[model samples]
Target: MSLYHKILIGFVLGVIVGLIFGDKAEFIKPLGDIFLRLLKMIVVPLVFSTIVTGIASMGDVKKLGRIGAKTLIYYMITTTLAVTIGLILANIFKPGKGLSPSFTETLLNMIPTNPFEAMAEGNMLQIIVFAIFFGIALALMGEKAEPVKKFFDSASEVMFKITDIVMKFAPYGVFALMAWTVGKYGLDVLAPLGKLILTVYLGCIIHILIVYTLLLRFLCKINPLRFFKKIKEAMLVAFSTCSSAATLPVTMRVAEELGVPESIASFTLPLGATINMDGTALYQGVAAIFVAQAYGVELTLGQQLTIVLTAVLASIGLVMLTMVLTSVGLPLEGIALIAGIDRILDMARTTVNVTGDLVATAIVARTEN
Candidate 1:
C-alpha cells in the first residue's frame, strides 16, 4: 500500500480508538509527543544544510538575487490575497458574535547572540537569517569554498536519508497525535464555534482553488491539478505534522519529481517555509475580526485594515497584537472558544501553507526558465 493509504488508515483507526477510549486516550498522547520531538530533532540540521547547500549550489550570487526577488514578490502578493479573503469572510460571518467578550526577549533575542543558541531555541527566523548569510559568504568565496560546500551538500543528502527514516514512522505518529487530539476535544468542542471553524476551512479551500489555481493556470499556464497530484505525499505530511518546516524534505523531493529545478526548489522552498505563510495570514485575518465582533467592539475600516497589515507580517506581529488587545481591556476568555479548536484549524492552515509553498516554487521555476 502507498504511504498515503497507510496514513489514511492510521488516521481512521486513531479516531475510532479515540472515540472509544475518550479520556483514557491521553495515555497514548506521549506517542504523538515523541513523534513530534523526532521530527523537531531533524528540522534544524535539515533546514540549515539544505538551505546553505541550495544557495551555494547556484554558483551565482547575481542569479540568486533575481530568484530571491521573484520569490519574495510572489509570497507578498499571495499572502495579501489570503488575508484579504479571510477578512471578507470574517466580516460576513461574524464568527465572534455571542462568544462571550473574550478576549519575548532582548539582546540575546535580537539576531541571536549565537547561531547555535538560535537553533537550540528553535528560533526559525533567526536561523534562516544565519543560513542565508552563511550561504552567501560561501558563494562569494567561489572555488575556495568548494570544500565547505561539498561538506554541506553531503550533509544535506544525509539529512534527506534521515528524514526518510523518520517519515517511515509517520503513520504511527499521525495516528497517535490524531487520537489524542480527538479524545481530548471530541466533536463537542467544535459545536460552539462551528461557524468560525467553517469560515477558516472554507477560506483555505477557496484560496487554494481560486488564488493558487489562477496563478498556476494564468501565469505559469500549467494545470494546477497536475501539480496537486504530484505533491500528495508532501501535502499529507504537512497536514499531519502541521509544520511546513518539518515537511520541507518531502516538499523538495516532490517539487523535483514534478520537474522543478533543484536550484529553484532548494532556494525557494526553504525561504517559502520561513516567510510564505498565506494560510497563517488568512487565519489571523479571520480570527482578529472574529474576536472583535464577539466582544461587541465594532472595528472601523481603519481597524480592519490594521488586521490586514498585521496578518501580512505573520505570526510575531499577530501575537503582539493579541497581547495589545488584552492589555487594552478585551476579555481573555473570549479566546477560550477558539483555542479549543485551534489544532483542527492549524491542520487546515498548515496544509494550505505547504500548498502555497509548492505553488510558489512551480511558478518561479517556470518564470526562471
Candidate 2:
C-alpha cells in the first residue's frame, strides 16, 4: 500500500480501538506517545546536520547570509499576514463561543516556568533554536568546522534513513491514536470540530490560493499549479501526519523535482520545516480567538493584536515545528480543550503548512535564479 494509505489505515484503526476500549483503552495511548517520541529523537540532529552541511558546502558565508536574510524576511511577513487573516475570520465566525467554559481556565493555567524546565520537558522551540544556533556557529568555523560538519552530514543521512524505516509504522501509530481518541471521547470529542474544521480549512485555503498564488505568479512566474501538482504527495503525507518534520524527506524530494536547486533545497526546505509556519500562525489566530469566544471572553482589538504579535514571535521560534498544536501554548493541558477536533482539523492545516513551505521555496528559488 502507499504510505498515505498505510497512515490513513493506522488512523482509522486507532479510532476504532479507542472507541472500543474507551478511557480503559488508555494503555494504547502510550503507543502514540512512543511514536511521536521516536520521531522527535531525530529532529534535532536532522535539522542541525542538514543545515550545517548545507552551509559548509556552500563555502560562501556571504551568499549564505543573503539567502538567510531573504528567507527569514519572507517567512516573517507571510506568517504575520496569515495570523492577521486568521484573527479576522475567527472574529467574524466565532466558532467556539457557544461551548461550555469547562476548559478555558484550565488552559490559562498551563504555562511553563523556567524555559529550561520547558526544554527538559522537551519543549520543541528550545530544541530548534539550539539546533539553528549550533548549525550556524558550525558554519562560521571554516575548515575547523569540516570534521563536525561531516559528522552531522553522516548523522543526518542516517536519521533520514531511520525516519524512512519508522514511517513504515505510521499507519499503525495513526490508527491507534485515532481509535483511542474516538473510543475515549466518542463523537462528542468532536463537538465543535465541524465549525473549527471549516474555519481553519477556509483560512488555510485563503492563504494558499490568494497569498501563495500571488507569490508564485508575480514573484516567481512559475506555474503555481505545476508546483502544487509536483508536491501533492508531500502535501498529502503532511496533512495525514500533521507533521512538517516527519514529512521532511518527501518535502525535500518534491523541492528537488520542482527545480529547487539542491543547494537551496538542502538548506531551505529543512530550515523551512523548522521555522516557517504560515499555516500554524493562521490556525493560532483562529484557535486563540475561538477559545476566548467559546468562553464568552470578548477580546478587544488590542488582545487580537496581541495574538498576532505573539504568533509571529512564536513562529520565528518554531513553536509549531512539533506535531502537537498545543505546544504553541503553555500548561500543555490547554491542548486538551482544543484536543476534541484537532485530528480532523490537523489534516487540512498540515496540508497548508506543507504548501506554505513549498510556496516560500518557489518564491525564493525564483528570486535566486
Among these predictions, the greatest lDDT belongs to 1
Q: Which consecutive 10 residues in model 2 have the weakest lDDT in total?
A: 321-330
What lDDT score is found at residue 54 in candidate 1? 80
Instruction: Report lDDT (Cα) of residue 328, candidate 2.
Output: 31
Name the Cα RMSD for model 2. Answer: 7.0
Runs of candidate 1 with Cα error greater than 4 angstroms are 101-113, 316-333
Model 2 residue runs over 4 Å out of place are 1-34, 100-151, 181-185, 246-250, 257-259, 295-303, 316-339, 342-350
- Cα miss at 292, model 2 (Å)? 4.5
lDDT of 2: 0.69
lDDT by residue (170-192, candidate 1, tens digit) is: 78988998788778877688788
Residue 165 lDDT (model 2)? 78
Clashing pairs in 1: 102-331, 102-334, 103-331, 103-334
